[PDB]
Amino acid sequence: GSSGSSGRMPTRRWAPGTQCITKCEHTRPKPGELAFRKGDVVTILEACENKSWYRVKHHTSGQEGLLAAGALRERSGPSSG
Predict the structure, then answer these.
(1) For position 24, which CATH number holds?
(2) Do residues 26 and 7 touch, judged by C-beta distance below 8 A?
(3) How many domains does the chain have?
(4) CA atoms within 13 A on the CB side of 70
(5) Measured between alpha carbons, how far is 33 from 42 in angstroms, rounded to an integer?
(6) Count of C-beta atoms within a 10 Å radius of residue 72
(7) Do residues 81 and 65 make contact, with C-beta atoms less than 8 angstroms apart?
(8) What is the Cα–Cα distance from 30 to 17, expressed in whole angstroms?
(9) Residue 42, exposed/middle/buried by CB under 10 A (0-12, 13-18, 19+)?
(10) SS3 category, 75
(11) Is the dihedral of CA 57, 58, 64, 67 positive or negative?
(12) What domain range is 28 assigned to?
């Protein structure tokens, strides 16, 4: 493996290993996509690379599919200290 490490770079998007939550529930994803429910925890497997699409891993399920970059949020609800 080899990564591009020159010096320092800014950050904006989520990185691999960050827990993202779904904005809505998806029972029937596109043809070749993963399914999930509303408020599902997933781990960023890799960085987006399909134009507004991220690859996460469903905990409960355990599969790996693409997710709408515009359908993910930062796990942070008004519950649990």
Answers:
(1) 2.30.30.40
(2) no
(3) 1
(4) 3
(5) 14
(6) 19
(7) no
(8) 24
(9) buried
(10) coil
(11) negative
(12) 1-81
Listing DSSP states for 4-65 in one string gives: --SS-----S--TT-EEEESS-BSS--TT---B-TT-EEEEEE---SSSEEEEEETTT--EE
Question: Dihedral angle at the C-alpha atoms of 15, 21, 71, 55, nearest 10 degrees?
Answer: 40
Nearest 5°: the CA angle 63, 50, 23 is 60
Tallying the residues shown for the chain, one arrives at 81
Which experimental approach was used here? NMR
- CB-based contacts of 30: which residues, under 8 Å, 6+ apart? none
DSSP code, position 72: E
Between the alpha carbon of residue 43 and those of residues 15, 37, 51, 60, 79, the distances in Å are: 9, 15, 19, 11, 21
